[PDB]
Amino acid sequence: AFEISDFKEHAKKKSMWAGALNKVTISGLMGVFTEDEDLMALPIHRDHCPALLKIFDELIVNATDHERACHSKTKKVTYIKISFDKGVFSCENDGPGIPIAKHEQASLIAKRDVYVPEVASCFFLAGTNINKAKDCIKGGTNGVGLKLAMVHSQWAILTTADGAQKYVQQINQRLDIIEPPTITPSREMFTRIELMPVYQELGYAEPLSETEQADLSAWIYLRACQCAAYVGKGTTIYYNDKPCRTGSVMALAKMYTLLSAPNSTIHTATIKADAKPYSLHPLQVAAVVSPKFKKFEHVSIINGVNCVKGEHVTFLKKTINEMVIKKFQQSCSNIFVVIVGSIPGIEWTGQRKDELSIAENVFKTHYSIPSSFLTSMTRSIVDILLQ
Amino acid sequence: AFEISDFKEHAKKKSMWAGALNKVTISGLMGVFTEDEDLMALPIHRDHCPALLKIFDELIVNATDHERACHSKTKKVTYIKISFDKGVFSCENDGPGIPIAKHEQASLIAKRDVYVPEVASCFFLAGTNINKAKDCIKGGTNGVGLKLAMVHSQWAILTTADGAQKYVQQINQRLDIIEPPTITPSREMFTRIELMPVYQELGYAEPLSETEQADLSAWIYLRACQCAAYVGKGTTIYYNDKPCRTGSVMALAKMYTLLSAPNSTIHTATIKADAKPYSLHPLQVAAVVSPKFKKFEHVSIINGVNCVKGEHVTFLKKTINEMVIKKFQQSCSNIFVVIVGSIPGIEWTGQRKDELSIAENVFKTHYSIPSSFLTSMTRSIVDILLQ
Ligand SMILES: Nc1ncnc2c1ncn2[C@@H]1O[C@H](COP(=O)(O)OP(=O)(O)NP(=O)(O)O)[C@@H](O)[C@H]1O
Ligand SMILES: Nc1ncnc2c1ncn2[C@@H]1O[C@H](COP(=O)(O)OP(=O)(O)NP(=O)(O)O)[C@@H](O)[C@H]1O
Ligand SMILES: [Mg+2]
Ligand SMILES: [Mg+2]
């Protein structure tokens, strides 16, 4: 009756790692769709498998983490290329590759030659964020995300090049079959993950239906557009070899409000903090206020992660609410707001990183929302309330 | 740079297991306080460590799981006794004890005699829910919760008796030191976990401050009261040897609304489904509608777990909203609602079990909310809207 599981078997059966392992109703599920030359974020009103969307997210956050790691160094990340075609998902980024070197501890554990890229892709609770600095703004913390991608892949290829050598390794049948890597001379420098998810096991048609393909493509495109707003000014994000043109929170706010509030006013702010490490990490904000909006909604890209709940939102809402109450006397259900940037020292409620955890006083003590933004938001909210 | 962690080290450092490992702002944090002979649920407006509250929850859900496992058997669980004194937390339940038997697979893994209760308390990804049936309504699924309690304990004692023998085992220094167990003849039958959390490591004073002690006591008492509404009619819940008198969703609804809406109308329903396994699991509902309530709030005890988000809430809200719209023409921000019961086949977003995951169509297809409840709720909501 009392059974003991290994990580692989556990990750194939348990929702705690990446969420539900079958299709469920995902509240607020969105994708981006192109109408003419316009990008429009629209709801996806069909059940989808959270764990499937999460293994796409794990690879994308790994690439955005690498962009952040490299952004002040000589060899920077200049691109992240995301691809989705015939069911195959890939994510490739430039900059220094995963070191092509024997890992002494892993080789002893496994009783065979294990190189660093195999540790990164095949060993659970393993990576460069196991001892994470208090000020680190990478999303990665657990050493599990890439292994979850591998466990939900029928086949996967890890390719990395360090400017000297290229390493290619097949990781097949949900991490059951790790093929010995092919190592060759190369002047390339990059990391690529290519995989075919276990679509049928996660509740999808094999091959994907027209609707499943379209929904997954829209979701991935929007996730790439979210990255594009987060990464540094030197990095381009591509989706199926097309650049994602959403380099600002204003561009993100437009994509989400184009159908409901075309030709709208975009209230903008940079939220800044008054002490390191917070002062190193300004937050970019764009908000639209419309009577057509039925309840408060945010899109938060924090540390490269799409965060659906956190005290950073609460801080903005309470601050606006206090001003609205005062002006009206002489509050948030008509706001759509985009918040993008890094926050050091956050913790998460789970591997999925749906909710960040923090002391509210971090914002009260350190951060200031520009008066001009609060005044313009309050003016717009009050006019609606008055009507 | 690339490090490989064991489970214990990982659980002491990573928020993914039990949430943040220091004090943060927990939205909606509540405890129960006794004023005179009255029980009143009130907000706790102070930061607390989620992982600390979760190891209390892991033991309480294990006891409620055992109550559910035993409820149709000859030897039932008749009590769950929760204690909190001088920093020491204990949870004891009657009914069949954890088997006192050598575990052959664990003994081979560890290269020494390992009995089943040591597997349950000290081996990660281990327990009786590793292969969980599609219709199982126990909260336990991952084989990790009791190990997280042990990893966040300076010292812990596991005591179990199977009516033949008693097994006592010390598990000390955050699972670093597993003492060999003491096995003796006994006619007792029970399972007890007693532990002292690592309060200082999780941001608390050593010993607890007056306020920390009072807040943690209030939180635990309310969690016990939540259990009392969930368990079968034959089981009594005690907190510090006093029975928890909240045997109904009406009693729970009263405790949450006593300060804001004394002498209120309680709308009641049993939500029933039309096919097994759903039909085995009626949901008990009590709701209060007041103009004094500023936004929609629910307390959901699902499969013994305090669930803060799920499509069961959405189903009730949408159903009420449709009726309200219709009546008004001739909607949920004034509702407080308690929902208690079992839902088979749910998945979670994480080990914490904050959010359940399910297809919305489960409710649309199988479940029916009684017309008399919808009519009485709609009458109360409409009167407020009209005012
Ligand atoms: N695209 C990439 N480019 C470079 N290095 C990478 C890339 N993806 C992963 N890595 C490395 O591989 C390690 C393992 O990745 P992963 O399993 O996702 O763990 P993580 O990102 O550190 N933490 P988490 O994602 O929270 O579980 C990372 O710590 C990086 O060092
Ligand atoms: N109070 C208890 N009474 C009887 N059996 C218990 C009790 N607590 C734990 N157990 C047993 O010990 C096992 C390990 O507990 P635990 O680590 O909490 O895993 P779980 O409850 O199965 N899953 P999860 O809590 O989701 O990680 C359980 O599966 C039960 O078989
Ligand atoms: Mg990662
Ligand atoms: Mg458990």
What is the 3-state secondary structure of chain B? CCEECCHHHHHHHCCCCCCCCCCECCCCCEEEEEECCEEEEEECCCCECHHHHHHHHHHHHHHHHHHHHHCCCCCCCCEEEEEEECCEEEEEEECCCCCCCECHHHHHHHCCCCEHHHHHHHCCCEECCCCCCCCCCCCCCCCCHHHHHHHCEEEEEEEEEECCEEEEEEEECCCCEECCCEEEECCCEEEEEEEEECCHHHCCCCCCCHHHHHHHHHHHHHHHHHHHHHCCCCCEEEECCEECCCCCHHHHHHHHHCCCCCCCCCEEEEEEECCCCHHHCCEEEEEEECCCCCCCEEEEEECCEEECECHHHHHHHHHHHHHHHHHHHCCCCCEEEEEEECCCCCEECCCCCCEEECCCHHHHHHEECCHHHHHHHHHHHHHHHHC
CB B35 within 8 A of CB A163: no
Quickly count: other Cβ atoms within 10 Å of residue B185's Cβ: 8
Q: How far apart are CA B60 and CA B55, in angstroms?
A: 9
CATH number, domain B249-386, options 3.60.40.10, 3.30.230.10, 3.40.50.410, 3.40.109.10:
3.30.230.10
Tokens standing for residue B209? 């401050």
- Taking CA–CA distances from A105, the nearest residue in chain B reads B4
Rounded to the nearest angstrom, the minimum Cα separation between A4 and chain B is 4
Domain ranges of chain A: 7-243, 249-386
CA of A160 to the centre of ligand 1 (A): 13
Interhelix angle B311-329/B371-386, nearest 10 degrees: 60
Taking Cα atoms as reference points, which of A283, A302, A303 lies closest to residue A366? A283
Q: How far apart are CA A144 and CA A123, in angstroms?
A: 8
Q: How far apart are CA A67 and CA A78, in angstroms?
A: 8
Q: How far apart are CA A22 and CA B258, in angstroms?
A: 41
* Deposited resolution, Å: 1.7
Q: In chain B, which among 124-143 make CB contacts under 8 A with chain A?
A: 125-128, 130-132, 141-143
Q: How far apart are CA A275 and CA A285, in angstroms?
A: 20
Q: In chain A, which among 77-106 make CB contacts under 8 A with chain B?
A: 99, 103, 105-106
Tell me, yes or no, if B116 comes closer than 8 A to chain A by beta carbon: yes
- Taking CA–CA distances from B98, the nearest residue in chain A reads A2
**Strand pairing report for B335-341 and B297-302:** parallel
CB contact under 8 A, A15 and B357: yes
Tell me, yes or no, if B177 comes closer than 8 A to chain A by beta carbon: no
Tokens standing for residue B246? 């909240």
Mention every residue, 6+ apart, whose C-beta is less than 8 A from residue B167: B97, B98, B100, B115, B117, B158, B159, B160, B161, B181, B182, B183
> Cα dist. A286→A291, A321, A373 in Å?
17, 17, 9
Taking Cα atoms as reference points, which of B379, B354, B348 lies closest to residue B300? B354
**How would you list the strands of the sheet with A305-307, edge to edge?**
A305-307, A297-302, A335-341, A283-289, A267-273, A367-368
- Looking at residue B329, its amino acid is Q
Tell me, yes or no, if B25 comes closer than 8 A to chain A by beta carbon: yes
Tell me, yes or no, if B13 comes closer than 8 A to chain A by beta carbon: yes
Taking Cα atoms as reference points, which of A375, A374, A369, A345 lies closest to residue A283? A369
CB A135 within 8 A of CB A343: no
Superfamily of domain B7-243: Histidine kinase-like ATPase, C-terminal domain (3.30.565.10)
User: Which residue carries 């980024």 as its tokens?
Assistant: A93
Buried-state track A50-89, b at ≥16 Cβ within 10 A, e below 16:
bbbbbbbbbbbbbbbbbbbbbeeeeebbebbbbbbeebeb
Instruction: Using an 8 Å CB-CB cutoff, list chain B residues near A96.
Output: none
CB A231 within 8 A of CB A238: no
In degrees rounded to 5, what are phi and psi of residue B299?
A: -125, 115
Nearest ligand to the CA atom of B144: 2
CA A373 to chain centre: 27
Atom of ligand 2 nearest to the CA of A16: 26
The response to whether residue B103 sits with its C-beta less than 6 Å from ligand 2 reads no
Tokens standing for residue A194? 């290519």
CA of B150 to the centre of ligand 1 (A): 29
**Could you give the angle at the alpha carbon of B101 between the alpha carbons of B95 and B105, nearest 5°?**
125
**How would you list the strands of the sheet with B305-307, edge to edge?**
B305-307, B297-302, B335-341, B283-289, B267-273, B367-368
Q: Whose CA is nearest to atom 6 of ligand 2?
A: B62
Q: How far apart are CA A349 and CA A342, in angstroms?
A: 18
Taking Cα atoms as reference points, which of A341, A336, A376 lies closest to residue A255? A336
Taking Cα atoms as reference points, which of B259, B288, B249, B302 lies closest to residue B380? B288
Task: Name all residues whose Cβ lies below 6 A of ligand 1.
Answer: A 58, 62-63, 65-66, 93, 98, 120, 127-129, 140-147, 191
Of A24, A126, A357, the CB nearest to B20: A357
**Could you give the angle at the alpha carbon of A357 between the alpha carbons of A277 and B308, nearest 5°?**
165
Taking Cα atoms as reference points, which of B44, B49, B141, B77 lies closest to residue B347? B141
